[PDB]
Structure 1
């Protein structure tokens, strides 16, 4: 049972294919077209079925060349409206039919962000991008919006001829639009069955540069060069990910560097990963996000969570693989440094939510919960900590990597629950069931708060971060002059980020300490988005008024929720900036990504 979907479940009928024919209208901010769904009945005498929709205008439903009756139910908040269609003739089990729905999206579609020319790098053309995870595909097209159903897809997208369309599929040609010579139709094909949250679309003045045998980097012209350098390690990471998870089956691995308002660090859209431009640090230091999106080609896109209650299966296994790729490239000490950092981020989330909060559980219950509101680091890091604890318990990385590859092969092209994963883990590790039975499964999977056991981490790279952090925390006014730029000379950007993360966990620090830190370390000059975010949070939480314009600018010049949400919350919690934070949100709200605007509004308690 998928409590986030109002559609007929996979036990009633399954969508096998989607043929999408649509036109992107930038003047009306609409996507208009037909969604032809090939649906297979799973029951005898099937006479109707229900699909998910959200703010879609339905023109008609055609089956067998004739219009059929359909009805839209009452809207159910974030779930949208159910769409029940009456089939013209009763279907037997395993019988397939094609249902073509003529539809149009609302300009306020929660899946899309429509950008005016002024909001782009080039300033001449508008831009459109989608973000369907978790349940926003129903705000683009009528569908069984649940990851328990996997389908293939084809698409034909008509856009103004000067613009380029890309999808989470192999590019299958382009032609001038026969109905309008000012437009082009771009064609796409996704031959691997995917859950519908992996359907993606971008339309903009895009250019590409090849960076590997199976990778093009796409962005607006102004970002192509920087992006090609930033993501040059992509092919090396794909080769390591193939060694760990088995064959890459998607053909192409392209990257799209979105405009700054892209709400996440990355989105593992098959064939075309979407990434935030905030990764463009200039030194490849934020490339673990690419390793994470690459990892999703096995964990998430091949083996998918059956419902959003088992989302930890997607992220925990992906973080586990991501950290192995980064450990293959930079060493086992580095994999331990990243794993220990992840534990610290898990501490932060559990502190923020509270140790008894239902969203700190590994397996969650999203009945009447908007998945967007539930989103946090818990499925990522508590999921990772579980797998890292099992790796140590079961004999090391080489043994657990053998399980991981067999897990991916076992469940490729399927949607699974925590019980399916746990059963396979016990089957694979049959000779270690006595060891597995020592795990407190009820606490690990179903209890809130920090896990009952903390794994063993190598501290080599972390020690200098903890030591410098503790020097600053225990310093008094007469110790401030001992600090100097030389304190950071043997620290990598990762170690500087971990120093700030350790210090931010004990914030606020005295204002004089923060001012001294800017005096000697000049953290205000750092463009690296992770370091700048933590330093600005440290400044605002330590009540430095000078940091208010810097934090407001960072929160609005980009829109990656990881940065924008805590920056606005810190600005709202500081009395000196409270009114400015609320006013800035109000004046930027209309131009923000719809999901980000909703979440910042909830965080700020502004309706």
Structure 2
């Protein structure tokens, strides 16, 4: 019942074809996937075999085509018998197609492929005994978006979802994105809800665990175990129950968290039954846990209901950001939800302003070919433009109460399936017959296919106003007060006593933006007011300078750089050797290079090999390499 230009862009058949896979997934049904693996720290390889139970769907070739990337494929059997196969030469950026002749007799058949990972594997990071805080080797995966094919041969598309079983042999503890079949050096798991390959998660190392709720356990290195338990144990069950009330019962069983090694490059990864989390989430006060509301919301938007291709990634991340903000809003109130959206708005702006090819990459729905790296399309746009389209819909349809019935209908309809934007729109229209005119007033063309910032909503700015006022006040007084004594008369620790970490982050951000009002048009620099910038750090030492929150600490370093306080460059350099999260590492190196390149390249050369392959790659070229 949707509008014409949408009708016009929609394919004749949904879900829309995924151009990022070399597999012939439309030709088969994947009924079950079993992983039988062995982890070798000695060789830094995972080897073994994957077994698929498949069903031919109906001049057939007839061939199986699977995705691989830098795998060593060793043998292939169908129904117990050796099957002819050939790997095609690599084509970037999608990899090496594996081609299998299936002379199998029946429509239903079993496919077994023996393989091992290689040194060029893009799915894993390996750490040796000397690299981990705790003294033993460690490995973990990160498969999103198309790295699963570098871990095992598969139909590597989010259109394909399958139950899994897994046996993993390792000389150290293993966690997996499934429920453990309980107790050895052989870890068995089951994932009884069908999942896409990109959600598979594995880690192995010196892991211990501790309960953080009635259905939640945290896993991490022993030295950090109790800190992690304290950080999560007061809040995780509350988050789950909050999400369940907004949507419906959580059906995955356990909700566990793996707090990864310091080289971990993302904030989190929503592997089912084992969220992967950055240790920089641990602040010792519980400031950063919304990253957990985020991964938790994925249980519904992403895991249960999945985007069919990377062109429609907004369905995953936009919904998740929307749901995440509903959780925090339900717990903390609307001003908190709106504050989070306000920070997200400025993240969106920066992302689009910093963009290479904004005309292409800032549209909500993407158009990747088979020549486009799906990475190249990941930005803040699917998150925040996605969120803003949903927030707009919430509003015009009558508010949370009117929208929540749709949310439940949507996640129920597509549970365990994959979909495209067009199917999302059909569902929206089928659900609101009485509201057809309101939905037809939505400029679907601008929201879905046009580049740039969408129309700006009217967020409640209550929790940011105090922050903006102070940053403005600091910008002004920097040009008026001279001696530190002067500053202490105007400012004191009292003025940020009520600032949470998000507010501190926004404050320090606004300062490098030199205020949130054009009183001083010129982007003058803090470098020329050392007494003020030094007084800042002094007066606010308790809450900013002494903070154990990596988010605030990072901003503190950045303010220090924007103010070119040279005596602090050393602490930035060394701190950067302590974290691996891209969000801090990449910008950190950009910051340090703009004030001391001889130190930035010296620092990188020192820590380069401690970072995740991805983070090392991007920092390498950030530093002109």
**Same fold judged by TM-score > 0.5?**
yes
CA distance in 2, matches of 1:543, 1:417: 48
Residue 174 of structure 1 and its aligned partner are, at CA, apart by 4.6
User: Which of 305, 310, 326 is the matching residue for 1:324?
Assistant: 326
Deviations, residues 36-86 of structure 1 (Å, cap 9, x unaligned) = 112221238562111111111011101122211111111123322111111
Structure 1 residue 48 corresponds to structure 2 residue 63? yes
Residue 247 of structure 1 and its aligned partner are, at CA, apart by 1.6
Match in the other structure for 1:77: 92
Structure 1 residue 146 corresponds to structure 2 residue 157? yes
Deviations, residues 378-400 of structure 1 (Å, cap 9, x unaligned) = 21111111111221221112222
Conservation of the 8 A alpha-carbon contact between 2:53 and 2:110: yes
Structure 1 residue 185 corresponds to structure 2 residue 186? yes
Give 1:252-331 correspondences, 5 Å limit. Answer: 252-331=254-333
Match in the other structure for 1:596: 615
Aligned residues: 588
Match in the other structure for 1:17: 32
Structure 1 residue 444 corresponds to structure 2 residue 456? no
Deviations, residues 74-118 of structure 1 (Å, cap 9, x unaligned) = 112332211111112365xxx221111010001331110101112
Residue 484 of structure 1 and its aligned partner are, at CA, apart by 2.4
CA distance in 1, matches of 2:62, 2:470: 68
CA distance in 1, matches of 2:265, 2:421: 28
Match in the other structure for 2:456: 454
Conservation of the 8 A alpha-carbon contact between 1:47 and 1:89: no
Residue 170 of structure 1 and its aligned partner are, at CA, apart by 0.3
Give 1 or 2: higher strand fraction: 1
CA distance in 2, matches of 1:254, 1:521: 37
Change (3 A) 1:508 1:556: farther
Change (3 A) 1:146 1:505: farther
CA distance in 2, matches of 1:355, 1:475: 40
Match in the other structure for 1:179: none
Give 1:424-443 correspondences, 5 Å limit. Answer: 424-443=427-446
Change (3 A) 1:364 1:542: farther
Residue 548 of structure 1 and its aligned partner are, at CA, apart by 2.3
Match in the other structure for 1:391: 394
CA distance in 1, matches of 2:307, 2:524: 39
Match in the other structure for 2:169: 158
CA distance in 2, matches of 1:488, 1:351: 30
Match in the other structure for 2:518: none
Task: Please list every run of 5 or more consecutive structure 2 residues that lacks an aligned counterpart in the other structure.
Answer: 1-16, 515-522
Conservation of the 8 A alpha-carbon contact between 2:85 and 2:99: yes
Conservation of the 8 A alpha-carbon contact between 1:132 and 1:199: yes
Structure 1 residue 5 corresponds to structure 2 residue 26? no
CA distance in 1, matches of 2:123, 2:244: 31
Residue 599 of structure 1 and its aligned partner are, at CA, apart by 2.0
Secondary structure of the structure 1 residue equivalent to 2:364: coil
CA distance in 2, matches of 1:568, 1:372: 21
Change (3 A) 1:46 1:281: same
Secondary structure of the structure 1 residue equivalent to 2:468: helix
Secondary structure of the structure 1 residue equivalent to 2:286: coil
CA distance in 2, matches of 1:126, 1:370: 31
User: Which of 421, 424, 449 is the matching residue for 1:421?
Assistant: 424
- Runs (4+) off by over 6 Å: none
Match in the other structure for 2:502: 494
Conservation of the 8 A alpha-carbon contact between 1:354 and 1:449: no
User: Which of 403, 406, 409 is the matching residue for 1:406?
Assistant: 409
Change (3 A) 1:57 1:355: closer
Match in the other structure for 2:603: 584
Residue 411 of structure 1 and its aligned partner are, at CA, apart by 0.9
Change (3 A) 1:354 1:449: farther
Conservation of the 8 A alpha-carbon contact between 2:342 and 2:459: yes
Conservation of the 8 A alpha-carbon contact between 2:78 and 2:104: no
CA distance in 1, matches of 2:269, 2:305: 16
Match in the other structure for 2:123: 111
Secondary structure of the structure 1 residue equivalent to 2:174: strand
User: Which of 500, 511, 529 is the matching residue for 2:550?
Assistant: 529
Give 1:337-376 correspondences, 5 Å limit. Answer: 337-353=339-355, 356-367=358-369, 368-376=371-379
Secondary structure of the structure 2 residue equivalent to 1:427: helix
Secondary structure of the structure 2 residue equivalent to 1:556: coil
CA distance in 1, matches of 2:620, 2:373: 15
Conservation of the 8 A alpha-carbon contact between 1:19 and 1:37: yes
The range that moved more, 578-587 or 386-395, is 578-587
Change (3 A) 1:528 1:128: same
CA distance in 2, matches of 1:583, 1:102: 43
Conservation of the 8 A alpha-carbon contact between 1:313 and 1:418: yes
Conservation of the 8 A alpha-carbon contact between 2:290 and 2:328: yes
Match in the other structure for 2:216: 215
Residue 363 of structure 1 and its aligned partner are, at CA, apart by 1.2
What's the C-alpha RMSD, in Å, of the aligned pairs? 1.8
Match in the other structure for 1:378: 381
Structure 1 residue 570 corresponds to structure 2 residue 600? no
Structure 1 residue 518 corresponds to structure 2 residue 529? no
Residue 463 of structure 1 and its aligned partner are, at CA, apart by 0.6
Deviations, residues 465-501 of structure 1 (Å, cap 9, x unaligned) = 1111211233343236223222212222222122123
CA distance in 2, matches of 1:533, 1:21: 42
TM-score, normalised to structure 2, is: 0.91
Task: Please list every run of 5 or more consecutive structure 1 residues that lacks an aligned counterpart in the other structure.
Answer: 176-183
CA distance in 1, matches of 2:158, 2:524: 42
CA distance in 2, matches of 1:333, 1:268: 27
Conservation of the 8 A alpha-carbon contact between 1:373 and 1:599: no
CA distance in 2, matches of 1:396, 1:157: 48
